Amino acid sequence: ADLEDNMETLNDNLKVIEKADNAAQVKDALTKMAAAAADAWSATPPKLEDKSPDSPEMHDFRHGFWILIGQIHDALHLANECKVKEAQAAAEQLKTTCNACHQKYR
Amino acid sequence: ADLEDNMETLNDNLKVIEKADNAAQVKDALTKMAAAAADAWSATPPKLEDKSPDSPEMHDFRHGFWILIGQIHDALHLANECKVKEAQAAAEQLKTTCNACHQKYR
Amino acid sequence: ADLEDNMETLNDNLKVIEKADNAAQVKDALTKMAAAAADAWSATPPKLEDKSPDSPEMHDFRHGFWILIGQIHDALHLANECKVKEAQAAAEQLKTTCNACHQKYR
Amino acid sequence: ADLEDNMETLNDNLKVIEKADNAAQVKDALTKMAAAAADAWSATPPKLEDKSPDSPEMHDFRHGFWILIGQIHDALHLANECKVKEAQAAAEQLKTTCNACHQKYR
Ligand code: HEM
Ligand code: HEM
Numbered sequence: 040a041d042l043e044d045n046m047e048t049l050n051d052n053l054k055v056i057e058k059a060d061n062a063a064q065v066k067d068a069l070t071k072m073a074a075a076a077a078d079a080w081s082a083t084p085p086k087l088e089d090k091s092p093d094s095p096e097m098h099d100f101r102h103g104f105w106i107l108i109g110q111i112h113d114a115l116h117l118a119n120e121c122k123v124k125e126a127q128a129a130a131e132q133l134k135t136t137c138n139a140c141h142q143k144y145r
Numbered sequence: 146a147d148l149e150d151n152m153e154t155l156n157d158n159l160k161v162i163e164k165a166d167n168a169a170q171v172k173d174a175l176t177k178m179a180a181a182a183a184d185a186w187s188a189t190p191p192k193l194e195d196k197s198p199d200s201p202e203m204h205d206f207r208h209g210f211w212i213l214i215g216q217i218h219d220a221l222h223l224a225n226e227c228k229v230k231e232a233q234a235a236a237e238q239l240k241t242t243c244n245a246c247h248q249k250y251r
Numbered sequence: 252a253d254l255e256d257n258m259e260t261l262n263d264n265l266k267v268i269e270k271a272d273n274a275a276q277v278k279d280a281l282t283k284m285a286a287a288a289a290d291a292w293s294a295t296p297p298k299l300e301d302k303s304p305d306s307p308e309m310h311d312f313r314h315g316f317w318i319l320i321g322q323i324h325d326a327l328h329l330a331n332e333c334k335v336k337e338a339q340a341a342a343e344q345l346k347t348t349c350n351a352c353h354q355k356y357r
Numbered sequence: 358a359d360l361e362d363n364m365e366t367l368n369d370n371l372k373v374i375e376k377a378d379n380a381a382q383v384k385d386a387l388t389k390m391a392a393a394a395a396d397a398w399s400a401t402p403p404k405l406e407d408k409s410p411d412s413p414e415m416h417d418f419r420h421g422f423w424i425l426i427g428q429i430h431d432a433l434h435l436a437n438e439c440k441v442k443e444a445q446a447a448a449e450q451l452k453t454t455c456n457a458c459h460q461k462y463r
């Protein structure tokens with residue numbers, strides 16, 4: 040999958056999580072988010088097509104994904120404990136990371 | 146320090162960070178934040194005086210601090226990297242965590 | 252709690268985990284480790300009594316605790332997920348963090 | 358890149374790091390390590406071709422990558438901070454993660 044396309048998988052699963060009823064559903068939604076993040080990992084964003092893979096601005100772009108993945112990692116443990124509402128809140132809270140990268144590189 | 150006291154330290158240093166000029170100032174403010182968070186970890190909040198240290202709400206209260214500390218850890222690396230504005234935004238973004246716990250347990 | 256003493260709580264519970272039988276035992280051992288680390292957080296080590304709270308060396312000493320706490324945080328989730336052996340391995344593996352700090356500052 | 362291929366990228370850059378002189382070299386090697394880890398994340402290992410992507414076994418295989426990635430993230434901060442030797446030692450210490458997974462699923 041491509042960048043914008045991974046981003047839509049991130050967006051749709053966030054919606055899936057918000058609305059879910061049970062631990063297995065968030066389980067699965069977060070799992071798909073993790074894969075999408077992992078895929079996005081090496082992608083070059085339109086805004087930075089000029090920059091090299093070594094620039095400060097590529098390094099900082101990627102860093103945003105480390106944060107996201109670490110946060111999906113944690114939400115997933117909460118899910119795996121059947122702290123369903125707790126996992127939804129963590130899912131909701133990670134929008135701060137989405138936003139922080141969008142405001143810089145999108 | 147007690148829990149309200151640690152919270153003030155957190156709120157104050159956030160202000161310090163927002164307004165700061167150089168890396169050393171942010172470094173220092175985050176460092177104090179990290180100590181306050183570390184101290185607050187063991188505390189019992191008024192709202193849960195009547196629950197047990199082993200409660201769901203106690204295990205979830207504590208968890209918020211691990212999030213915050215992890216996020217202060219990261220912002221500090223940015224500061225140490227002279228990515229000052231980057232560190233200020235990370236500082237800014239962890240109000241998400243502050244708020245999430247306040248809504249629940251304040 | 253004073254530093255060496257927190258360290259002994261860290262060492263004793265590591266033994267406890269290594270030998271445990273059930274999830275609840277490891278839960279409790281890791282919980283106590285977490286509190287010990289959180290207390291140790293701000294302590295000044297003998298080797299650095301002449302250094303300032305702001306020095307590079309104090310910052311780097313503190314950093315080691317960030318790592319330990321984040322690793323205890325993770326191991327705890329594994330315990331809470333009834334993945335007992337997985338949690339014992341994670342407990343076993345964070346000896347690397349113990350060691351890395353001892354070799355520098357002990 | 359395939360699983361075995363990502364593993365060699367991991368092993369090679371570890372060497373590169375061991376032997377390095379300056380921080381850009383470590384920076385660059387860790388960066389490549391993170392991409393390899395990110396790519397590997399989705400892989401199915403030969404030992405579990407017969408289990409399902411939903412298994413206890415697959416969930417636990419994947420978890421090891423999150424650990425490794427989290428550890429590469431941290432070591433990279435150290436590199437970015439010109440704490441070269443510190444970054445080398447962190448690189449070295451994450452062999453504990455490499456080994457833990459190999460003992461289990463290689
Ligand atoms: C976090 C969970 C997250 C979500 C959700 C998300 C979604 C998303 C949308 C909905 C878009 C709009 C693109 C469009 O054309 O409609 C979008 C675009 C970009 N994002 Fe994103 N995205 C999330 C996270 C992140 C993170 C963590 C980063 C940076 C590390 C990031 C970056 C970007 C970039 C760049 C784009 C634009 C890409 C382009 O080709 O125009 N996003 N994402
Ligand atoms: C995050 C950086 C954070 C900030 C900032 C913050 C601020 C803050 C203030 C200013 C108050 C008190 C206002 C008054 O007039 O008394 C306050 C109080 C509480 N907080 Fe807080 N706080 C932050 C973080 C967190 C986190 C992460 C938690 C839980 C995980 C948490 C909890 C609480 C609680 C409980 C109180 C009030 C308890 C009391 O004895 O009054 N805070 N915070």
Ligand code: HEM
Nearest residue numbers: 255258259261262296312315316319348349352353356357
């Ligand atoms: C990690 C899990 C960990 C263990 C285990 C550990 C053990 C330990 C002991 C048992 C002592 C004192 C022996 C006694 O009973 O008298 C001790 C002392 C020190 N440590 Fe340690 N320690 C662990 C973790 C860490 C970490 C993460 C750091 C660095 C940030 C660190 C450092 C030190 C230092 C310095 C001492 C000297 C204390 C003293 O003897 O006065 N340790 N440790």
Ligand code: HEM
Nearest residue numbers: 361364367368402403418421422425454455458459462463
């Ligand atoms: C950590 C940085 C790490 C290193 C280093 C590493 C090395 C490594 C080598 C050298 C091989 C040999 C491959 C070959 O046949 O040519 C290898 C293979 C496997 N590894 Fe690995 N590996 C590191 C990390 C990890 C982690 C985190 C896991 C699990 C989460 C893991 C597992 C495996 C598996 C499985 C193989 C075998 C693949 C195959 O032979 O088809 N490794 N690794």
Ligand SMILES: *C1=CC(=O)N(CCN2C(=O)C=C(*)C2=O)C1=O
Nearest residue numbers: 119120121122274331332333334
């Ligand atoms: C979340 C709700 C629930 O019932 N379970 C099962 C209980 N459980 C443990 O206590 C440890 C593993 C486990 O399944 C949940 O995880």
Ligand SMILES: *C1=CC(=O)N(CCN2C(=O)C=C(*)C2=O)C1=O
Nearest residue numbers: 168225226227228437438439440
């Ligand atoms: C803070 C970040 C920074 O880079 N510097 C000065 C020189 N320096 C680097 O540029 C990279 C490591 C290093 O010491 C700061 O003072």
Ligand SMILES: [Zn+2]
Nearest residue numbers: 043044046047
């Ligand atoms: Zn689009």
Ligand SMILES: [Zn+2]
Nearest residue numbers: 113208324328
């Ligand atoms: Zn957690």
Ligand SMILES: [Zn+2]
Nearest residue numbers: 146147184185
């Ligand atoms: Zn106190």
Ligand SMILES: [Zn+2]
Nearest residue numbers: 153154156157
């Ligand atoms: Zn004040």
Ligand SMILES: [Zn+2]
Nearest residue numbers: 102219222430
């Ligand atoms: Zn970071």
Ligand SMILES: [Zn+2]
Nearest residue numbers: 255256258259
């Ligand atoms: Zn002693």
Ligand SMILES: [Zn+2]
Nearest residue numbers: 255256258259
């Ligand atoms: Zn002794």
Ligand SMILES: [Zn+2]
Nearest residue numbers: 112325328420
């Ligand atoms: Zn984990």
Ligand SMILES: [Zn+2]
Nearest residue numbers: 358359396397
């Ligand atoms: Zn590949």
Ligand SMILES: [Zn+2]
Nearest residue numbers: 360361362364
């Ligand atoms: Zn092979």
Ligand SMILES: [Zn+2]
Nearest residue numbers: 360361362365
């Ligand atoms: Zn081969």
Ligand SMILES: [Zn+2]
Nearest residue numbers: 359360361362
């Ligand atoms: Zn191949």
